[PDB]
Amino acid sequence: NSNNLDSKVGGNYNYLYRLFRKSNLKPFERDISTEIYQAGSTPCNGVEG
């Protein structure tokens, strides 16, 4: 536990996790891409609606 170092009163927002991936990772693999994720069939033109 590290609630005495990585915690801020107003809330620390510098630790991120990835949601919304297309497929599952393989062992010891790393993905650092920042792309728009298409949930439906509408053709995302690099914007979030």
Partner 1 sequence: CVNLPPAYTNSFTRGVYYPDKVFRSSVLHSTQDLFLPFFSNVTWFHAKRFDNPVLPFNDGVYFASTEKSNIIRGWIFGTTLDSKTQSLLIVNNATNVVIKVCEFQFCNDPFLGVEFRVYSSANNCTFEYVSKNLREFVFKNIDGYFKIYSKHTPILPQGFSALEPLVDLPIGINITRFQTLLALHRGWTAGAAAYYVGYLQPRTFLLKYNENGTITDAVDC
Ligand X SMILES: CC(=O)N[C@@H]1[C@@H](O)[C@H](O)[C@@H](CO)O[C@H]1O
Contact residues for partner 1 (CB under 8 A)? 26-30, 32-33, 35
Nearer to partner 1, 8 or 30 (CB): 30
DSSP one-letter code for 1:
-
Contacts 24+ apart (CB under 8 A), 26-30: none
Q: How far is the CB of 10 from partner 1 (least distance, A)?
A: 29
* Cα gap 21→39, rounded to integer Å: 10
Q: Tokens at residue 14, please?
A: 């510098």
Choice between 9 and 47, CB closer to ligand X: 47
What is the binding site for ligand X (CB under 6 A)?
23, 26, 32
